[PDB]
C-alpha cells in the first residue's frame, strides 16, 4: 500500500513501486574510512545561513521537516565539491527506537543515534521540482547525532514537537537559526547518491560531516514521541525512519581531509 518503515511497506519493499531503489547510485552507504580517497582539489565548504528564514515545521508522516523560504539566496551552500549555489529548502532527521541505531550513513559500520539532513537545490534549475530531475540538482549536508550533552540550538525544535504530533499537522516556526546545528569542524566525505525516501531520485551530491553533534537522551526521547499516523488513527510511534546502507557499486567516496 503506501511506503513506510514497517514490516509490510518497509525499505525492502520500495523497489516494487520505485524500481530505482536498486539503481547504481543509491543512498545511504557505509563510509569505509580506510578506502575513502583524500582529494586535495576539494575546496572547503561555504555555509552562509546568516540570512536564513524558517517558516514552518510539518509532520509529513515519515519525519518532521522545518521549511525555509527559498525564493531568494538567503541560506546557501557552495564550495566543497559543488559548482554553483545551492539554496536551503528544508531540514529533517532520521532516528531510531534505541540509541545504537537511527543514522542512515554509517562510518566503518558504526551507526549513530540520528542523522540530520539539510536539503539544498541547485539554483541554476530555478525550482526544487526541476532540480530533482538532474544529476547535480541537490546537495544534502548530513550530520550525525550521538547522545551525550544537550545541544542548546536544537531545543526550540524539541519544544514544538508536541504541536505536530500526527501526520499532516504543521506549526509556524519562524526565526530558527540552523547555524546552531553545525559541528565545529566542516571536514567531510562526499559521493554521488540519491534521496533516501521514495522517489529515491539519484540527483544528490552528498556532503557528510566527519564530526557528529551531541544531543541529550531527553532531546532524542522527544523525537520518538511523534506519530507516523494521522489524528484519530491507531498510534504508531515515529521511530526507525532510516533506510539501511546500499551497495556502493561503481562509486568512490572522497575525503576533504587526511
Ligand atoms: Co533524509
Swiss-Prot record:
Record's subcellular location: Cytoplasm; Cell membrane
Active site: 62 (proton donor/acceptor)
Location of Phosphoserine modifications: 163, 170
Keywords (A to Z) from UniProt: Acetylation, Cell membrane, Cytoplasm, Disease variant, Lyase, Membrane, Metal-binding, Osteopetrosis, Phosphoprotein, Zinc
Record carries keyword Zinc: yes
Site (Fine-tunes the proton-transfer properties of H-64): 5, 60, 65
Annotated phenotype, changing residue 62 to G: Impaired activity, not rescued by 4-methylimidazole (4-MI)
Effect of residue 199 to A: Normal CO(2) hydrase activity, but impaired stability
Means of activity regulation: Activated by X-ray, histamine, L-adrenaline, L- and D-phenylalanine, L- and D-histidine, L-His-OMe and beta-Ala-His (carnosine).
Effect annotated for changing residue 65 to L: Reduced activity
pH dependence: Optimum pH is 6-8.
Effect seen on changing residue 60 to D: Strongly reduced activity
Molecular function via GO: arylesterase activity; carbonate dehydratase activity; cyanamide hydratase activity; zinc ion binding
Pfam annotation, one family: Carb_anhydrase
Binding, Zn(2+): 92, 94, 117
Effect on the protein of changing residue 196 to A/C/H/P: Strongly reduced activity
Keyword Metal-binding: yes
Catalysed conversion reaction: hydrogencarbonate + H(+) = CO2 + H2O; urea = cyanamide + H2O
Annotated residues for binding of substrate: 196-197
Main localization category: cytoplasm
Top-level taxon in the UniProt lineage: Eukaryota
Marked site (Involved in the binding of some activators, including histamine and L-histidine) residue numbers: 90
Record-stated family: Belongs to the alpha-carbonic anhydrase family.
More details: Target of drugs used in treatments against glaucoma disorder and breast cancer.
Role this protein plays: Catalyzes the reversible hydration of carbon dioxide. Can also hydrate cyanamide to urea. Stimulates the chloride-bicarbonate exchange activity of SLC26A6. Essential for bone resorption and osteoclast differentiation. Involved in the regulation of fluid secretion into the anterior chamber of the eye. Contributes to intracellular pH regulation in the duodenal upper villous epithelium during proton-coupled peptide absorption.
Protein name in the entry: Carbonic anhydrase 2
Organism: Homo sapiens
Organism taxonomic ancestry: Eukaryota, Metazoa, Chordata, Craniata, Vertebrata
Name of the gene: CA2
Amino acid at each position: 500500500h503506501h511506503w513506510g518503515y514497517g514490516k509490510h511497506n518497509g525499505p525492502e519493499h520500495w523497489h516494487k513501486d520505485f524500481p530505482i531503489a536498486k539503481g547504481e547510485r543509491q543512498s545511504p552507504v557505509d563510509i569505509d574510512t580506510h578506502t575513502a580517497k583524500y582529494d586535495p582539489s576539494l575546496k572547503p565548504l561555504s555555509v552562509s545561513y546568516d540570512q536564513a528564514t524558517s517558516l514552518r515545521i510539518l509532520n509529513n508522516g515519515h519525519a518532521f521537516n522545518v521549511e525555509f523560504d527559498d525564493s531568494q539566496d538567503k541560506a546557501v551552500l557552495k564550495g566543497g565539491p559543488l559548482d554553483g549555489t545551492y539554496r536551503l529548502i528544508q531540514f529533517h532527521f532520521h532516528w531510531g527506537s534505541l540509541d545504537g541505531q537511527g543514522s542512515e550513513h554509517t562510518v566503518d559500520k558504526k551507526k549513530y543515534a540520528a542523522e540530520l539532513h539539510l536539503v539544498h537545490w541547485n539554483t541554476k534549475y530555478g525550482d526544487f521540482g526541476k532540480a530533482v530531475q538532474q544529476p547535480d540538482g541537490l546537495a544534502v549536508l548530513g550530520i550525525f547525532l550521538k547522545v551525550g550533552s544537550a545541544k542548546p540550538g536544537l531545543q526550540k525544535v524539541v519544544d514544538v514537537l508536541d504541536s505536530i504530533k500526527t501526520k499532516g499537522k504543521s506549526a509556524d516556526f519562524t526565526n530558527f537559526d540552523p547555524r546552531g546545528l553545525l559541528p565545529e569542524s566542516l571536514d567531510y566525505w562526499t559521493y554521488p547518491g540519491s534521496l533516501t525516501t521514495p522517489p529515491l531520485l539519484e540527483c544528490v551530491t552528498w556532503i557528510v560531516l566527519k564530526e557528529p553533534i551531541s544531543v541529550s537522551s531527553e532531546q532524542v526521547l522527544k523525537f520518538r514521541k511523534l506519530n507516523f499516523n494521522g489524528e484519530g488513527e491507531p498510534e504508531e510511534l515515529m521511530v526507525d525512519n532510516w533506510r539501511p546502507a546500499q551497495p556502493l557499486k561503481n562509486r568512490q567516496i572522497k575525503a576533504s581531509f587526511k
